[model samples]
Target: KTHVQLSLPVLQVRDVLVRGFGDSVEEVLSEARQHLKDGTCGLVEVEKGVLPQLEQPYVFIKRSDAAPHGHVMVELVAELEGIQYGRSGETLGVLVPHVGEIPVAYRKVLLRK
Candidate 1:
């Protein structure tokens, strides 16, 4: 195992712009943060804007193993511990223009060349 003590980025959920209901925001954020630290899945492979005008933003996690559903349709990096949206848990953190709901750390990484 190419095990290297990797330094993970800090997660930040500033705007709290989630589309679904029921899931606690704190719980969701906490899960994503954990996954980032635990090596569950928090790396961005592709970043792009949503459809229509392509204004919304989304990042494809390293382990999105499946297809997305709606709104840029990108799944959260870490997603769930058991297996799980905006649940801080909504694996899909959409960075709509003027509305940055995705955890900043994930958002921050997608902005580079």
Candidate 2:
């Protein structure tokens, strides 16, 4: 098994950019900063099942505040664990000739050249 160690890009959400009802601006930023410093981030795999669609990798940000502005509130939830947009699996390295005649036509040309 290949255990890959990786670090995701840091997500920065300023207090001025977030809008909400209860939590004070300072409070929210404080919470977010604390979470960031705590090393509580996520690494997600898209597909856990078959024929799943895959997405580019991205970490989840905590939802610290309710964004009512022209922006969405971004925060890495401690309980959310991670975000999933798609899936992953074995990819076909070669095209099947029975599926389509295209691969056969190109195969001869590829070998010839």
Candidate 3:
């Protein structure tokens, strides 16, 4: 048998504060209570690529921190799954390779920079 390599762009982000994952949100919160009792920050780094459905393309991320406030950041990749750049040379607002949906709000935020 021959091995077929699957290559999808990696989705990564940093410095995000998340309350919790979908179903695991409550669980994480419960664990957080214990952490607070122990005088530790109740945030945890959910393992990377936890979103396999999102595995097709796009981006997502979360983080654990000292102050422990719910602050989270998500990163979206231009090329992956089926998403591709428009004629903007990867500036922003490019259509995602997979579904061809423009990053409207995402691009607006970048432009505000």
Candidate 4:
């Protein structure tokens, strides 16, 4: 048996002041938290729920510490499930590629395929 290789375009931003994957937001923040622990990844601050409707995962990042103008936000569509870019939510442009495999539930396995 062979493992299928997958590749997707990733947009990375830096120096975003965000908290841990808190409970307030589940899907988005949780992904962000994993990246935070990964060292190289940055965090985006979610002050007062900046984009509550942003159902998809996203992140806002600053390019430089001194140059705020060089900031960037990279968001991905599709919830790592379907091949098509799903929906762009309020936190549309923020993303974290929390690389690693967790136990797949029966429902998710079906949806992903």
lDDT of 4 by residue, 9-103 (tens): 23222322342233233454445534533533332334555435333334343221111122232333323222333343343233344333221
Report the error of model 3 at residue 32, Å.
1.0
Which regions of candidate 2 are displaced past 4 Å? 1-22, 41-113
Q: By the lDDT metric, which is better: model 1 or model 3?
A: 1
| Segments in model 4 whose C-alpha atoms lie over 4 Å from true places | 1-24, 40-55, 62-93, 98-113
Instruction: Between candidates 1 and 2, name the one with more favorable lDDT.
Output: 1
> lDDT of all predictions, in order shown?
0.31, 0.24, 0.24, 0.31
**What's model 2's lDDT at 16?**
16
On a 0 to 100 scale, what is the lDDT of residue 110 in model 1? 22
TM-score of each: 0.24, 0.20, 0.19, 0.24
What global local distance difference test value does model 4 have? 0.31
| Tens-digit per-residue lDDT, 39-79, candidate 1 | 44333222352222221223223323332222122234222
Taking all chains together, the TM-score of candidate 1 against the true structure is: 0.24
Ranking by lDDT: 4, 1, 3, 2
Ten residues in sequence with the least summed lDDT for candidate 1: 51-60
Q: Tens-digit lDDT track for model 3 on 11-94?
A: 122222332222333343343333323432212122544333222222222111111122222112223445432222222111
- CA shift of 93, model 4, Å: 6.5
Among all windows of ten consecutive residues in candidate 3, which has the lowest summed lDDT? 104-113
Residue pairs with colliding backbones in model 3 are 17-71, 17-72, 82-97, 82-98, 83-96, 83-97, 83-98, 84-96, 84-97
lDDT (tens digit, per residue) of candidate 2 on 23-63: 33344334433433453322222234311221112222322
